[PDB]
């Protein structure tokens, strides 16, 4: 939060001659490391005689099942760990009324293209650097099918300029909720407590399984991680949120 | 399904580009295109509002 | 199929302490060579004539 | 070592384990010959309570 200022007359005894109080203050926003995991268990002689190398299979299957996990709760809040107190970037926009929904058929203020463009006012007006679009696969098919009121297709060309443009390739990004996200990427952190770990496991018990008396073999993955919002003030006022969102109609 | 008519975003053109977007959103890269005769001449003849 | 990860809490005694297993898993997806044919009979006369 | 093998926890026991194994096939080729169908390619020869 900001102080505030004030004009003042030059007075011995009117209230308006009194040079005001005011306060500036400060929060704390935090990284809590959260553990996500898998074991996967097999047989010895199944590893043994497959064609592949099926232990490197799991293991890359494994380090997607955990890079999946965590864009589902940072992206979205869906399986998001407790302990992590900053919203995920969804949530932060829609309870900041940065959400905007889109007017379906040709072209118009608030097509898809306008919707990108009120997420980035949102954000360029409270104070922030919009500067990173967050989008599911099938985004570039809808901005270049978007039609004008003739039926021309008038975005073909466009490339977004001063975003760095991500899409979401390991389905952590859900059918009929959002769009694409704007963020000014410097307002977020992602803690790497431990990245993507693997141990081969042969004696161990995992669930109800014996491993060696049992001739199975397991990998254990794990990674360790952390997210964090900087939603606090920006020289424009107080509770600022840095992320705007494009959603569709219905929602 | 193709809406008949003047070019919109369900043309013939805005139907290719659904399935294309099908396709590439789940998981592959769409790169071929299966078409009569005749698909040339009505890519080629479909108009806008202004003909 | 994919296998799935899951969010861990530490603990030596509750259920929410322990890793969960799954599995990946593979399926055959098969050619049959299958055989499409025909015959065409003329007469013998018809032939030398064309 | 450190394995549960029957219900004998290995490493809190003090105990070790040596685990063997191999796996092996067989395959006799009781086929036809020269002298016709269903022929086995082994005599055997048998004490006299027989």
Redesign the interface.
Known sequence: TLPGASWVSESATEPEGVKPTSEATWADRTLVA????????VHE?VVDDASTSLLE??AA??G???G??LDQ?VIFGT?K?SSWVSPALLPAAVAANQDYTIVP?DANEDDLIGCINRASKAVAAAGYMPDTLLA???FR??V????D?????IFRDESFNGFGTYFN?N?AWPVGVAEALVVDSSRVRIGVRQDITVKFLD?????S?????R?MI?L???ARFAYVLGNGATAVGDNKTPVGAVVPDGS
């Open positions: 959260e553990e996500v995991a898998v074991i996967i268990p002689n299979e799991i299957l494994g997607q099942a955990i999946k996990k709760a399986d760990p058929g599911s696969l099938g098919f809808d270049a099918n978007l039609r009121a003739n039926g021309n297709p390739a389905g004696q161990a018990t995992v669930g399984i014996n491993l060696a008396e001739d397991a254990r993955l794990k």
